[PDB]
């Protein structure tokens, strides 16, 4: 091999790159321990694709292990964890053999592996031995442990490790306008270089400094946002013009210390800077847990036990006396913290397991590839804010004891009652893709919605595609084509039969067009809502419904290794919509049409050409031939009249009869777009042309293009014709000659060689806009007369193409890649391959399971706080992560903005005047004066004005006695439709001082 399957690994490949994945596919990974933590790690690594995965866990499955081990069932009790899990891991990814290691008595077996991961089933003594062996043998070692709401991980990649790309970001690149002798590089107009001190760059196309372009790297000294310095360039010549710089990521060698050395001298990465003082406390704490087990026959402290918690505190205290430097001189042991670590030691919590499962899986992929920056080397974590208020859900040995249930080790932390409230929750999940699958898995593990008063509703309108399987682990190859929500819900019922009959899988899109489905009664019945979406529009819509119905919303997002979480709490926080994200960049039309300088510009151009050739053209012909008023409507209603009519004229005068005709057409299009149009451009603006100011027209970011001479042996010329021909043929219902084969060059050659290609004649009156701002873009009459009458074309129909980026046989990406590349050859832009073209034209979002798991983990630590109806904003946490760095940051949600009228405080997002019934206008005005001290001044329903304090008596008499619905009918002339149950009214009002004041809106309940 040396071969990567794109149809499976597409979105992951945009995250890691081919090289990193090729190294992964030569790495053997071993995982020790298959409770929840181990199987999460294993799930993500197997999905990612490594050479092989081996699991070692000979312990018998016990009921409690089902707390977070989503591949165990009660049928498995008694059997070995490793064996039972092996077969289920194996289905995740047919390219990855999964084996079981029967024994670990001989440590030498570890030499078979490149990465060894030791989870919570391995004692600290065995961890140290194993690490010593791995480190001294050049095997990469990682360990992790979760205990209740606490966890850690440790990374040791040996004495010598090379990072090849520290961040996974695209290299920065830009156009140069000047390079002074001292090395000062100034950017071409309002472009920011984006570099950082000590980055490296190479150059191309710099004129006057020729050996600057040979691939040598120069070290960047940043002068400001618009310039950087590279050191004298006198020896190289004198700058004249042009130039592009490209950042180059250089290898970096690093060293890790052994577990033994780090136990006494840890290097910390923080998980939450608001808690940095805790890392050192917990590093002592986790060690103390092991000393406790050594002293007590392998057992951890017992749940909520005071006796054992004091012992753990003593143990930690002993450590800090012996090693004053760990907490620091004078710094006391945080006893409350150590106490909870003891109380929760046996806890096995899905959100924490998911967090470390995703994080550690990602570190395994770093260790295999040199892609991204390893955690170096200890990270500690807690989510103590997830604990419920003890007034509501008291915690103690009675309340927290086991009940012979799969949920025992969640009850160990939260108590039986809290766990029951989790069961009786009613929740809406919007989306059943990557986040959706992880989300349903966590909820299956929590028992969420499994109680007689609980339920889950999940909705997704999309079906399962092949690339989904790489990060949506509830789906299997046999499931491709089925509905995500339906298959997901079956999958998690298999994991936890308590949910049988409790999940309602729906197939609807959520938005304004489905409110008759997701109505008042549906929303009001929910306890809360969870997003699992992939577009900003759906998020905004849900956020708006949640505000209106006053339901909490748990929000999350990913992009490659980056992710975020947000909480939205009624009467407490800002909502999703309260804040703005940076918007999509927009390419000026002139740049696309005439002056491209980036492959992005040529890809967009080619994408529009594709659309016009094989979709718009066909739809236009079909309309013209079935609507006798089509022209008349075009002439008056189209901005681009000329274009639409030309499309139809052309589509009907060519008319191919065989496949050979399709080839002829495509070859002629090549001449038009890559030869004649370019000659036409050079006719209006010769290379050496100047402007109205004496200055060279082809300069700055305009590259002077050169026409193309067709060359069947050039890959891009060839595919432009092959894809154009086959697409044309499809439109016209003609059988392709490459319909059951690959395309034969000599066959194409033969047809093209006998063609006679018309020569270029310029058009001396053509004008081309140079600026967007500028203008402008008797003949149309002749155009219309040229059109054939539909009478001639009875039954004639064209078959339009629907763009489909993920079918490699359909010629679509083949066409856009080739078409973009030809135009790139015109303008001396480097060509791009199919993968890069698919990415840009298909607008694919890079995605990986590791980030998806971890972010879903954080969401589920926040969920606990909803179950306790927490009203202290300080307890909630918005998360921000980048697994590449690795970075984790958290912040308290922003408070909802407040207002005041007549000294009465109100919430500007959440508060509203609820009104019962189709109230009369006069009654509404009086209600507001008497009960709110507000003089209503303006009343409106949507876009129509219903009442104003400045209305004359005639108007007032027509309106004051009308129920609101009747008032709306009176003004809009449209009645209210029956499905409508609420009406939102906006008002302006004066307060008791006679001043206009901002107030809440009104909801009328019909």
């Amino acid at each position: 091999a040396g071969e990567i399957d794109e149809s499976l690994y597409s979105r992951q490949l945009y995250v890691l790159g081919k090289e990193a994945m090729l190294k992964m596919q030569t790495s053997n990974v071993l995982i020790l321990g298959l409770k929840g933590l181990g199987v999460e790690i294993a799930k993500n690594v197997v999905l990612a694709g490594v050479k092989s995965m081996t699991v070692f866990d000979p312990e018998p499955v016990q009921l409690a292990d089902l707390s977070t081990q989503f591949f165990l069932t009660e049928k498995d009790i008694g059997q070995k964890r490793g064996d039972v899990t092996r077969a289920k891991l194996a289905e995740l990814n047919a390219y990855v053999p999964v084996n079981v290691l029967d024994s670990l008595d001989d440590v030498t077996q570890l030499s078979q592996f490149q990465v060894v991961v030791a989870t919570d089933t391995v004692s600290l003594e065995d961890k140290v031995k194993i690490n010593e062996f791995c480190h001294s043998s050049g095997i990469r070692f990682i360990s992790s442990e979760t205990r209740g709401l606490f966890g850690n991980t440790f990374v040791d990649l040996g004495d010598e490790f090379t990072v090849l790309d520290p961040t996974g970001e695209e290299p920065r690149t830009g156009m140069v306008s000047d390079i002074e002798p001292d090395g000062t590089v100034t950017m071409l107009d309002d472009n920011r270089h984006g570099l950082e001190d000590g980055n490296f760059v190479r150059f191309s196309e710099v004129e006057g400094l020729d050996k600057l372009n040979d691939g040598t790297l120069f070290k960047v000294e940043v002068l400001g946002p618009f310039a950087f310095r590279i050191g004298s360039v006198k020896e190289y010549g004198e700058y004249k013009k042009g130039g592009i710089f490209t950042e180059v990521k250089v290898p970096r060698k690093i060293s890790f210390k052994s577990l033994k050395q780090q136990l006494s001298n840890p290097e910390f990465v923080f998980s939450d800077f608001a808690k940095f003082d805790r890392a050192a406390q917990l590093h002592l704490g986790f060690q103390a847990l092991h000393q406790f087990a050594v002293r007590h026959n392998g057992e951890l402290p017992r749940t909520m036990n005071d006796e054992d918690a004091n012992e753990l505190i003593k143990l930690v205290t002993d450590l800090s006396v012996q090693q004053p430097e760990v907490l620091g001189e004078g710094v006391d042991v945080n006893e409350d913290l150590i106490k909870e670590l003891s109380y929760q030691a046996r806890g096995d919590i899905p959100g924490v397991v998911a967090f470390f499962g995703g994080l550690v899986a990602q570190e395994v992929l770093k260790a295999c590839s040199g892609k991204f920056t390893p955690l170096k080397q200890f990270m500690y974590f807690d989510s103590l804010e997830s604990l419920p208020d003890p007034k509501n859900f008291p915690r103690n040995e009675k309340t927290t004891q086991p009940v012979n249930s799969r949920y025992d080790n969640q009850i160990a932390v939260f108590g039986l009652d809290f766990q029951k409230k989790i069961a009786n929750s009613k929740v809406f999940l919007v989306g059943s893709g990557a986040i959706g699958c992880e989300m349903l898995k966590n909820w299956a593990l929590l028992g969420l919605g499994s109680g007689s008063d609980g339920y889950i509703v999940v909705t997704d309108n999309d079906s399962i595609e092949k690339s989904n399987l790489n990060r949506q682990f509830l789906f299997r190859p046999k499931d491709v084509g089925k509905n995500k929500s339906e298959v997901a819900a079956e999958a998690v019922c298999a994991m936890n039969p308590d949910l049988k009959g409790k999940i309602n899988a729906k197939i609807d899109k959520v938005g304004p067009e489905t409110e008759e489905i997701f109505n008042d009664s549906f929303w009001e019945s929910l306890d809360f809502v969870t997003n699992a979406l992939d577009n900003v529009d759906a998020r905004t819509y849900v956020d708006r419904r949640c505000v209106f119905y006053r339901k909490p919303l748990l929000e999350s997002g990913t992009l490659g290794t980056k992710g975020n979480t947000q909480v939205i709490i009624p009467r407490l926080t800002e909502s999703y919509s309260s804040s703005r994200d940076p918007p999509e960049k927009s390419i000026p039309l002139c740049t696309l049409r005439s002056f491209p300088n980036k492959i992005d510009h040529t890809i967009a151009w080619a994408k529009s050409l594709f659309q016009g050739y094989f979709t718009d053209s066909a739809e236009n012909v079909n309309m013209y031939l079935t609507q006798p008023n089509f022209v008349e409507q075009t002439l008056k209603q189209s901005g681009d009249v000329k274009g639409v009519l030309e499309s139809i004229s052309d589509s009907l005068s060519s008319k191919p009869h065989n496949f050979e005709d399709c080839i002829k057409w495509a070859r002629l299009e090549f001449e038009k777009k890559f030869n004649h149009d370019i000659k036409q451009l050079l006719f209006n603006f010769p290379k050496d042309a100047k402007t109205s100011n004496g200055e060279p027209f082809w300069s700055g970011a305009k590259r002077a293009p050169t026409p193309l001479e067709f060359d069947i042996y050039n890959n891009d010329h060839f595919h432009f014709v092959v894809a154009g021909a086959s697409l044309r043929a499809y439109n016209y219902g003609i059988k392709s000659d490459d319909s059951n084969s690959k395309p034969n060059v000599d066959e194409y050659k033969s047809v093209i060689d006998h063609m006679i290609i018309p020569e270029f004649t310029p058009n001396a009156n053509l004008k081309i806009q140079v600026n967007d701002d500028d203008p402008d873009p008797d003949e149309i009459d002749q155009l219309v007369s040229s059109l054939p009458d539909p009478s001639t074309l009875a039954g004639f129909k064209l078959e339009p193409v629907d763009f489909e980026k993920d079918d490699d046989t359909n010629h679509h990406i083949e066409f856009i890649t080739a078409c973009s590349n030809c135009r790139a050859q015109n303008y001396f832009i480097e060509t791009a391959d199919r993968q890069k073209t698919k990415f840009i034209a298909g607008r694919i979002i890079p995605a990986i399971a590791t980030t998806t798991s971890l972010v879903t983990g954080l969401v589920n630590l926040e969920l606990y706080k909803l179950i306790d109806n927490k009203t202290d904003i300080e307890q909630y946490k918005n998360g921000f992560v980048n697994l590449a760095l690795p970075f984790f940051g958290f912040s308290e949600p922003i408070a909802s903005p407040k207002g005041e009228y007549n000294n009465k405080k109100y919430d500007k997002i959440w508060d509203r005047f609820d009104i019962k019934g189709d109230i009369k206008l006069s009654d509404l005005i009086e209600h507001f004066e008497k009960d709110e001290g507000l003089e209503i001044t303006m009343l409106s329903y949507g876009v129509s004005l219903l009442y104003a304090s400045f209305f004359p008596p005639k108007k007032l008499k027509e309106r004051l006695n009308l129920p609101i619905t009747q008032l709306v009918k009176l003004v809009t002339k449209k009645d209210i439709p029956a499905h409508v149950s609420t009406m939102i009214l906006e008002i302006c009002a004066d307060d008791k001082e006679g001043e206009d004041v901002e107030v809440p809106f009104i909801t009328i309940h019909l």
Binding site: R192, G557, S891
Partner: protein, 77 residues
């Protein structure tokens, strides 16, 4: 007359010169002059808190050599 740092979600480190009485507003505009992002789109967090427009660096106990984080909401999933 102090220095602070702003790390972005992509790993970039920005250095600023500020006085302890500067507003969040002030700081965000310095980030605009340096990064091109407009203040409305910037999200800055420090020590558990998101920084709000009307306050000062002093209100969040930001000291010299402190590191702030500029973060983003992601749209995929």
């Amino acid at each position: 007359a102090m220095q602070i740092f702003v790390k972005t979600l992509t790993g970039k480190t920005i250095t600023l010169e500020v006085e302890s009485s500067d507003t969040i507003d002030n700081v965000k505009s310095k980030i605009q002059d340096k990064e091109g992002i407009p203040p409305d789109q910037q999200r800055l967090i420090f020590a558990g808190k998101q920084l709000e427009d009307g306050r000062t660096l002093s209100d969040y106990n930001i000291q010299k050599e402190s590191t702030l984080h500029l973060v983003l909401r992601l749209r995929g999933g």
